[PDB]
Design a protein around this ligand. Sequence first.
Ligand SMILES: Cc1cc(N2CC[C@@](C#N)(C3(C)CC3)C2=O)cc(C(=O)NCc2cc(F)cc(-c3cnn(C)c3)c2)n1
Ligand SMILES: Cc1cc(N2CC[C@@](C#N)(C3(C)CC3)C2=O)cc(C(=O)NCc2cc(F)cc(-c3cnn(C)c3)c2)n1
Ligand SMILES: O=C(C[C@H]1NCCC[C@@H]1O)Cn1cnc2ccccc2c1=O
Ligand SMILES: O=C(C[C@H]1NCCC[C@@H]1O)Cn1cnc2ccccc2c1=O
Lengths: 484, 484
Amino acid sequence: TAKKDENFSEWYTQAIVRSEMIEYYDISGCYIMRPWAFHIWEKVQRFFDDEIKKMGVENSYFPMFVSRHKLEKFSPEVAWVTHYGDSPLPEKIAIRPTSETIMYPAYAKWIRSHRDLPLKLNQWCSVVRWEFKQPTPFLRTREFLWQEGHTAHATEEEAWELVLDILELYRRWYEECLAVPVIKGEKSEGEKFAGGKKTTTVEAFIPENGRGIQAATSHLLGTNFAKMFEIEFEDEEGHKRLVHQTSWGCTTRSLGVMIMTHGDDKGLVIPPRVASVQVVIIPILFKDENTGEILGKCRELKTMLEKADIRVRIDDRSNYTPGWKYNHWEVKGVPLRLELGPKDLAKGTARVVRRDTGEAYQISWADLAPKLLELMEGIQRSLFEKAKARLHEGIEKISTFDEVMPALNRKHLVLAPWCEDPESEEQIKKETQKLSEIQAIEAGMTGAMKTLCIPFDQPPMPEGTKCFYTGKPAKRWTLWGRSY
Amino acid sequence: TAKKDENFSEWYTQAIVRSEMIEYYDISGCYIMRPWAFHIWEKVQRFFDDEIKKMGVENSYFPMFVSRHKLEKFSPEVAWVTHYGDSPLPEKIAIRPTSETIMYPAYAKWIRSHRDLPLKLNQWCSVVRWEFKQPTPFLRTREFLWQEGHTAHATEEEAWELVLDILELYRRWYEECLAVPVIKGEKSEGEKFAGGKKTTTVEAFIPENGRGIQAATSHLLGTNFAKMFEIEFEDEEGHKRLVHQTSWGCTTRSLGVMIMTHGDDKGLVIPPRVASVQVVIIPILFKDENTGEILGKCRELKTMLEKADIRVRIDDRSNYTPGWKYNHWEVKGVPLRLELGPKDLAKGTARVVRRDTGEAYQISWADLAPKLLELMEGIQRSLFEKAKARLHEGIEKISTFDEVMPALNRKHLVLAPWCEDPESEEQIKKETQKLSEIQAIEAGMTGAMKTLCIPFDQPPMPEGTKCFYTGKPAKRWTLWGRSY
Ligand SMILES: Cc1cc(N2CC[C@@](C#N)(C3(C)CC3)C2=O)cc(C(=O)NCc2cc(F)cc(-c3cnn(C)c3)c2)n1
Ligand SMILES: Cc1cc(N2CC[C@@](C#N)(C3(C)CC3)C2=O)cc(C(=O)NCc2cc(F)cc(-c3cnn(C)c3)c2)n1
Ligand SMILES: O=C(C[C@H]1NCCC[C@@H]1O)Cn1cnc2ccccc2c1=O
Ligand SMILES: O=C(C[C@H]1NCCC[C@@H]1O)Cn1cnc2ccccc2c1=O
C-alpha cells in the first residue's frame, strides 16, 4: 500500500508487520521477534559464531544484573531493579546496558600470567537501554539482542589486529550475508566509545531518509579498562603489566538495515543466503486436473533441490488461489518461486520467478538444481551491487561548508577534508541543526549533521588542502551526514 | 581434595570451580558460566533445537519485561524494575519469571482460524526468580538459562500428544546426551503447575544427599489460559472455540545434574556425547628426544581422528609435565587421553586412558579412529548404566508409612501405593518434616518428603491394596522423597 519512495516509515512498518516479522508490544520501545525474522537472526548468528570460533573466541554467559558499585566505575538509560515483589532490595541492581563492568572483574581474577593470554570471550544475549525517544523496530529499541565480544592481549598490536579482524567479520556479516554495503572507518574523538582508545565502525546508508547508520562496532580499548579493573599479567621476567583489550558488538539492527536496503513496493526482499525459504513451490491445482500427480512431482522436486542444500517450502493449500500465494510469498520476500501445473509437467519443465526483478525462466527438471543455485547467487550479487551503487550515489565529495546544506537537502552524505579538531565537530552539529530548522520553517527527526566515520579508504589528499569548516590544514577525508 | 562420598557440597563446589565451569559473582544466587560449561549447554541446545524443529516448532524472541497489568492475571519471586536512572517509571515492569503472560496476548491476536493451528513456538533466553534462600550452582539460581516452548492446538488430544512427545525429547536430552537416567511421571494435584490441567515431568535422583530433583517439565494447559487470554479459533463451520495449549521447559540445571551424576573423587567426568574435548593428546617431550617428530605425529593423529568427527585437543605445552597434564584434563572431565612418546612412535601405537575407569589400551594408529569411536560409546553407555543402577538401588518399594523414615534415613526414595488425595500429601509433608527434625536433634536442607511424580511405568497393583498413609483404597504407585 505505502510506496517506499513516498512515506518510508509507513512502508517500513507495513513491510515488517504484513510479512509477520514483528509484533507490537504494550511496553513502548520493545517488539516481539516472530519466526520469519528470528530465522534470519539465527542465520547471521551461526555465521558469526563459526567465524569467531575459528579465531579462538569461546562463548560464555554472564549475569544480566550488575551491582551499583561495579557499574558506577548513559546513566538515565540504565534500568534499575529496586524491589523483589513489594519488598525493597538492600541495594538496587541494574540491568546490563553492556557487560564491561560485569565481565572485567572476572578477567582481573582469571589473568595472572602471559600464558593466560590472549583471553577471548563472547556472549549472545539481550541488553536494555531505556531511552524515552521514539523507537524504530530493529533499528532503535529499548531491549535488543546482540553479541558482545571482549578480549585481552599481552600487547597493543595484537589487540589492534583483533579489532581489525572482527571489523572484517562485521563487513562480511553485512555484505556477504545480508548483501548490504558498508564503509569501514574510525570514529571521531567526540563519537568514539569514551572508555576506549579508538573505535572502528562499519557504517551503512538509508537513501530514503538520507541517514547514515552505524552497522557494527569494534573498539581498541587499550589499557584503560585494565587500570580501572586491575587486569594485569606477568611476563616470563616476572614483571606485572597491564593487558590490552578489545570489545565489539553487533545487534538485530542489522536485520532492519537489510530490510530497508532491499525492500520494494511489494514488500520484503530477502537475500538468498539468509532466506529461511529460498524457493517456494506453488502447484497449480485446477479442479479438472490430476492433482495427485502434480503434488507428487512438487515433492520430488523439493527432494532434488534439498539435496543441493536449497531451502524449499511447498505451498499446496487448496483454499488459496495461485495469485494469492504469489503475493503472499512476495510480501514475505522469498527470493524464488517455482510454479508447476499440468502444462509444465507435460513439458518436463518448471516456471521460476525471481523476486528482485520479476524475471521469469523456464527450466528443465534436470537443470533445476544448478540453475537455481546460479540464480540465487545472481540475485544475491545484484542486490548487493545495486545497494552499493545507491551508496556511492548518496555520497557527495565536497570542499567547503557552503556545499553541506544543499547535499543534505538531497538526502546525501558528504565526504570532506577535515582537520579533526573535536570543537569543530560540535560547532558543525549545532550550525547544521540551526540551518535545518530554518529550512523546515520554509517548507511548512533531528537535523544535525555529525561525523559518521573517518574512512579507512582515504581518497588522495592534495597538498595544502584546507579543512572544509575551519580553514585549518586538513588532515583526513571524513564522512558526515544526518544519522540514526 | 573433598571426597564425593564425604562432604558432597564442597566436592561439588571444587569440581565446578577447579574445572573452570563457573565463576562466582557479587550478586548472590547468580553465577558466571565459563566456556567449559557453556560448550556443554550449546551441545544440548543444538540437540533439542534440531529435534523440535523436526516437530514444526520455530524459535522466536519475546521481551524480557512484562507490564504489571499483564502479569497479574510466586509474586515475591518477581523482580521489579521501578526506575530508569533515578527517575521513576509511571508503572513498574517485571522481569520475566516465565513468559505465558508475555506471549499469550500475541497468541490471541495471531490465532483466528483452525487453519492457523497448531501454533508452535519456542525461545531460548534467561528468566529470573528472586528467592532469598541459599543458591546451588546450576541447580537453583536466581537467574538461569532455559528454553520455554508454548503451543496451541485445535483439540486436547493433539496437545496431549505434543506434551508426551516433548517429554520424550527431555528423556533423550538427559539419558541420550547427558547419560543421566530419569523417570517419566505425572505430578500430583498439589505439585502440578497451577495454571494448567496436568503436569508431566522427568525426575532424577542424587544419591549422595538422597534427593530427587525435577529435570524438565511438560504441561498440558488445556483451555485454561485460552479463556484467560481469549485465544479462540473458528472451525470450518464458523463456530468459535478455545484452543488447547501446552508449555514446556528445561534449564541449565541439567548441567548440574550431569556433573553430580558422573563425577568422582578426581573431579568432573563428562559423557563423550557432550564433551567439547573428547580426546586430549599429550605428547611426551623428553629433553633428549626428536620432539618435532613426536609433535608432528600428534598433529597427524589429530587430523585422522577429526575426520571421524572426534573432537581433539593437543596439549603440547613444554612447561608442564605429563603428570600435571594428566591431572589437569582429568579434573576437567575429558573422557579419553592419548599419550604418545618415542617408544609408542617406534611401536606404531598410542596409549589411551579412559577417564571413567582408568583402564589403559595400546592401539595401533590404523585402529585408532574406530577403536576410539567404540570406546566413547562404551564410556557413554557405562556411565548411563551405572547411574541407572544407582537410581534403582536408591528406590525402596514400601507398603506402609512405618517404612518411610528408615528409607529416608538411607537417603532413598520410596515407591508407595497412594490414594492421591491432596490433603494426604500435605499431611505427609508436615509429618515427615517433624520426624526429620526430631532425628536431627538425636544426631547432634529441609527434611520434608513430598511426591516427586506418579510414574508412567506403573508396577502391578494387587486388588485391594490400601494407601500407605490414609488406609483408603490405593489408586496408583507414587514416587516420594526428599527433594530439591
Ligand atoms: C537496536 C539498537 C541498536 C543500537 N545500536 C547503537 C550502536 C550499535 C551499532 N552498530 C551497537 C550497540 C553495536 C554497537 C547498535 O546497533 C542502539 C539502540 C538504542 O539506542 N536503543 C535505545 C533507544 C530506544 C528507543 F526507544 C529510542 C532510541 C532513540 C531514538 N532516537 N534516538 C536518537 C535514540 C534509543 N538500539
Ligand atoms: C536453575 C533453576 C532451575 C529450577 N527449576 C525448577 C523446575 C525446573 C525443572 N525441571 C523448570 C524451571 C524447568 C521447569 C527447573 O529447572 C528452579 C530454580 C529456582 O527455583 N531458582 C530460584 C532460586 C534461587 C535461589 F537462590 C535459591 C532457591 C531455593 C533454595 N531452596 N529452595 C527450596 C529454593 C531458588 N533454578
Ligand atoms: O556498550 C558500549 C561499548 C561496547 N560494549 C561491548 C559491545 C560493543 C559496545 O559498543 C558503550 N555504551 C553504550 N551505551 C551505554 C548505555 C548505558 C550505560 C553504558 C553504555 C555503554 O557503555
Ligand atoms: O514457569 C512456570 C510454568 C512453565 N512456563 C513455561 C516453561 C515451563 C514452565 O514450567 C511456572 N512458574 C514458576 N515460577 C514462577 C515464579 C514467579 C511467577 C510465575 C511463575 C510461574 O508461572
